[PDB]
Amino acid sequence: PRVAFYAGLKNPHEGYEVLKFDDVVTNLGNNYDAASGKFTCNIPGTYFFTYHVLMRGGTSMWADLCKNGQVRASAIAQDAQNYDYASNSVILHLDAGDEVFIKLDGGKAHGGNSNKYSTFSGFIIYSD
Amino acid sequence: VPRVAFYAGLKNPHEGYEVLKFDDVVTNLGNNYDAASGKFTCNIPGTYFFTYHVLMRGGDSMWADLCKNGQVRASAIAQDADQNYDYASNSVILHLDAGDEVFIKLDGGKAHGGNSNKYSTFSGFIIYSD
Amino acid sequence: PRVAFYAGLKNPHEGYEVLKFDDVVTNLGNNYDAASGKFTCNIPGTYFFTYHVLMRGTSMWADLCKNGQVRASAIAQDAQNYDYASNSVILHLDAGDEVFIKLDGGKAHGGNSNKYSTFSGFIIYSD
Amino acid sequence: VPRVAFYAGLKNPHEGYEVLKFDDVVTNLGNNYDAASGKFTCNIPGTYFFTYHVLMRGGDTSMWADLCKNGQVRASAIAQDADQNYDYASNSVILHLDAGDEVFIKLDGGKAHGGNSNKYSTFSGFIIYSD
Amino acid sequence: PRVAFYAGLKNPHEGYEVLKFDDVVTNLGNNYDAASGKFTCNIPGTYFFTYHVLMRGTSMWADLCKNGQVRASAIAQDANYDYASNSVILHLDAGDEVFIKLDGGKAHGGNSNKYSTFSGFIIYSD
Amino acid sequence: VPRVAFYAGLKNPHEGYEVLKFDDVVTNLGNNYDAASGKFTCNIPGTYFFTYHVLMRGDGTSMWADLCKNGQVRASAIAQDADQNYDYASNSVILHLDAGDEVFIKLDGGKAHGGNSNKYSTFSGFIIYSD
Numbered sequence A: 001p002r003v004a005f006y007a008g009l010k011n012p013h014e015g016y017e018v019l020k021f022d023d024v025v026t027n028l029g030n031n032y033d034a035a036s037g038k039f040t041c042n043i044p045g046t047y048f049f050t051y052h053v054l055m056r057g058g059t060s061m062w063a064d065l066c067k068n069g070q071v072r073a074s075a076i077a078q079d080a081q082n083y084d085y086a087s088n089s090v091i092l093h094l095d096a097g098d099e100v101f102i103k104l105d106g107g108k109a110h111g112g113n114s115n116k117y118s119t120f121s122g123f124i125i126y127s128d
Numbered sequence B: 001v002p003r004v005a006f007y008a009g010l011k012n013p014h015e016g017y018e019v020l021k022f023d024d025v026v027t028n029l030g031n032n033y034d035a036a037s038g039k040f041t042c043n044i045p046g047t048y049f050f051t052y053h054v055l056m057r058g059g060d061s062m063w064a065d066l067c068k069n070g071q072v073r074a075s076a077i078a079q080d081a082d083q084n085y086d087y088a089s090n091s092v093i094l095h096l097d098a099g100d101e102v103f104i105k106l107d108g109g110k111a112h113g114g115n116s117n118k119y120s121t122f123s124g125f126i127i128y129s130d
Numbered sequence C: 001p002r003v004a005f006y007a008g009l010k011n012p013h014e015g016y017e018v019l020k021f022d023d024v025v026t027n028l029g030n031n032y033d034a035a036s037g038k039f040t041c042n043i044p045g046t047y048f049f050t051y052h053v054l055m056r057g058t059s060m061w062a063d064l065c066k067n068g069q070v071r072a073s074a075i076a077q078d079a080q081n082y083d084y085a086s087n088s089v090i091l092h093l094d095a096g097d098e099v100f101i102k103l104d105g106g107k108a109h110g111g112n113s114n115k116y117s118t119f120s121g122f123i124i125y126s127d
Numbered sequence D: 001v002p003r004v005a006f007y008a009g010l011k012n013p014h015e016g017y018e019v020l021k022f023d024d025v026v027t028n029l030g031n032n033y034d035a036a037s038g039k040f041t042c043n044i045p046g047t048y049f050f051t052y053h054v055l056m057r058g059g060d061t062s063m064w065a066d067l068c069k070n071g072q073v074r075a076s077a078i079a080q081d082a083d084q085n086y087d088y089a090s091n092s093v094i095l096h097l098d099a100g101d102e103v104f105i106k107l108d109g110g111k112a113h114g115g116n117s118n119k120y121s122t123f124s125g126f127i128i129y130s131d
Numbered sequence E: 001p002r003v004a005f006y007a008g009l010k011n012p013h014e015g016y017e018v019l020k021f022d023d024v025v026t027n028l029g030n031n032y033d034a035a036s037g038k039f040t041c042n043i044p045g046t047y048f049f050t051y052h053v054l055m056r057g058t059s060m061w062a063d064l065c066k067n068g069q070v071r072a073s074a075i076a077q078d079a080n081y082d083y084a085s086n087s088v089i090l091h092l093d094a095g096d097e098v099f100i101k102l103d104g105g106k107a108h109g110g111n112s113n114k115y116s117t118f119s120g121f122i123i124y125s126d
Numbered sequence F: 001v002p003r004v005a006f007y008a009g010l011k012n013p014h015e016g017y018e019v020l021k022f023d024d025v026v027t028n029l030g031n032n033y034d035a036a037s038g039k040f041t042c043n044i045p046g047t048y049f050f051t052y053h054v055l056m057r058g059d060g061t062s063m064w065a066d067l068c069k070n071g072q073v074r075a076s077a078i079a080q081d082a083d084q085n086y087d088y089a090s091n092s093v094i095l096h097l098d099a100g101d102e103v104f105i106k107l108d109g110g111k112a113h114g115g116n117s118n119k120y121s122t123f124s125g126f127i128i129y130s131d
């Protein structure tokens, strides 16, 4: 049996929703579904999954001393890193019908359009 | 010798492009600082020192988990740090004519409201009368 | 042959010790040992391994006081603290060879059963 | 016409909730600032300007995690702890003081850098008006 | 068919060049070439690839390419050591080239410590 | 009563270990501050207040700005962001000065922002008392 998929993330997601990787590059077995973001096992066995998800996260403030509206002194406060990755990998035994997907637990994921910044992939290692 | 000197703290949050209205008035010799407008209005023409310290408002990440059938099987975090507190501060010495206004105006961003803690301040005094 | 494992890190580690991934999810072949944090090869062959290890800010206030009552306050602050050290390898192994993740300074965060820090691998080819 | 003006720097590290003892004394007209206590004591009632600049201690601890075969590194990975930067807690006041009133800088948490004789952290003031 | 490689980056890279992983640890099939930084497919099939690139802080982009076509992208953001990493599964034909190339920034040269890595293996042949 | 007071801003970028030449002169009572050298020169012996605020360019990062009397340091300050943000190196002093004494701000590393006429970085002072 040949089960292997790889998809990237087009659109921004936030909150607690399932990440819907819709830029599908590989999908042997047609077991990944871009409308749901879920891999649904059909061949029972042991599977490898990996994911890389880019977070979308700078503050400044200016205070000027003015005389009759004209600036006589300027000052800035500033404290600007924004883009970072939440990545992991697993190996799981999967029965027929099992769903595997990536879920946000708070925060905002970057939508990379067709650039494949955020990805999700998997393949079967052994079939039962 | 005339006596003009003031010192006031900022109670409420301000933001954007507005005059900061320091309303926790600690000193106001000469009564030339007006907490309702945030403006010092010169009475005695002369040379003045002013200084200000304005605290920028600080603030408080993404979790992505792989689940099998809704059960978490791996967790991952990217941490949004940095939105620290920091200060926009300066000092000047200016000649003022009677009726001149001096004030601190924001030019972008969010100033912390300090309640009665006096984190953000504005002060000044006459050095010489004309 | 069937060799594949996956485990997460329950407790915090620090310094220069082996990471003992003790939340074992998968262990085909029983070649990963959660008591030692080590995978020990039994079938010689070529093996894939990967790992993700989660690492676990300063403020200071100075107030001007008049007879102990605050007349002005100030804060200095410079608060990112959680980042990952992760990598992947492919290695040929002989029987008896051990593969494990080792800290070389720093503090690894203990994730309880959330599996923030993980270690997994599988055989690609046996010899 | 009264003459009251002082200026002092912080030689030694302080932390926690203690009074900052500025003991690198540069100017002390009137002898009203006391380095042993960190306190200015009013003797001429009046209106006073004070200002302070206190440097927070900065600090260098990153994490390395390596996959080993038999103790030999076969992959390395670093997660970097950046931040902790030097930064300042500073403010200025104008206050009316009565005789015997004490003015001083007090930490309310954190670690102040000891500057030895470099005068990174400072405290100064002068009388504007006597009553 | 046995195709599997793993290599580390020795020297600092920067700009828009292909990352030439020259510290080769594994190379079953001899299909990886440290002199070019390229895996060249001999056996057509479905391949797994992964990479982890250490930025020396000017942000760093690192993309996996098939024949120059981006198939995965990764950023490490300089707002100062951070990683740009990703994994792909791709069908390859004979002669197809897979490699990691920088899209701006500075990649750290890890000597033989293997901070910056590139690996792959064939999952299925055709 | 002598009248000595100046206030000036920094127009151009500076860097390294040079004297900051604040050349956007707003106030210069007494004509004792010289924008071409960046130096205040004492002509009336007495006790003086000075203050400065130097914005670090946001390209680097640490920057140090020291107030010097005749080249000797009388205050030090550091700006640091180990993100390359704008931040300030600022301090204030009260000093006794003799005739001919020079007071100026000198960089001790890093890059100072050129603020053109916006007066982001400043240097001021005034006489408190004459001897």
Ligand SMILES: C[As](C)(=O)[O-]
Pocket: A076, F086, F120
């Ligand atoms: C200190 As600026 C960003 O207003 O040039």
Ligand SMILES: C[As](C)(=O)[O-]
Pocket: B085, B119, C075
């Ligand atoms: C400036 As605060 C609200 O941390 O005391």
Ligand SMILES: C[As](C)(=O)[O-]
Pocket: D086, D120, F078
């Ligand atoms: C970097 As420092 C304030 O110890 O000179």
Ligand SMILES: [Ca+2]
Pocket: A105, B063, B065, B075, C114
């Ligand atoms: Ca979680």
Ligand SMILES: [Ca+2]
Pocket: A057, A058, A081, B080, B081, B082, B083
């Ligand atoms: Ca942030």
Ligand SMILES: [Ca+2]
Pocket: A078, B086, C077, D087, F080, F087
């Ligand atoms: Ca800062």
Ligand SMILES: [Ca+2]
Pocket: B086, B087, D087, D088, F087, F088
């Ligand atoms: Ca600051």
Ligand SMILES: [Ca+2]
Pocket: A062, A064, A071, A074, B107
């Ligand atoms: Ca402005």
Ligand SMILES: [Ca+2]
Pocket: A081, A084, C080, C083, E082
């Ligand atoms: Ca990071």
Ligand SMILES: [Ca+2]
Pocket: A084, A085, C083, C084, E082, E083
């Ligand atoms: Ca990272």
Ligand SMILES: [Ca+2]
Pocket: C104, D064, D066, D076, D077, E113
């Ligand atoms: Ca190491």
Ligand SMILES: [Ca+2]
Pocket: C057, C080, C081, D081, D082, D083, D084
């Ligand atoms: Ca830190």
Ligand SMILES: [Ca+2]
Pocket: C061, C063, C070, C073, D108
């Ligand atoms: Ca307090």
Ligand SMILES: [Ca+2]
Pocket: B117, D108
């Ligand atoms: Ca408080």
Ligand SMILES: [Ca+2]
Pocket: A115, E061, E063, E070, E073, E103
């Ligand atoms: Ca790209």
Ligand SMILES: [Ca+2]
Pocket: A079, A080, B082, B084, C078, D083, D085, F081, F082, F083, F085
């Ligand atoms: Ca910072």
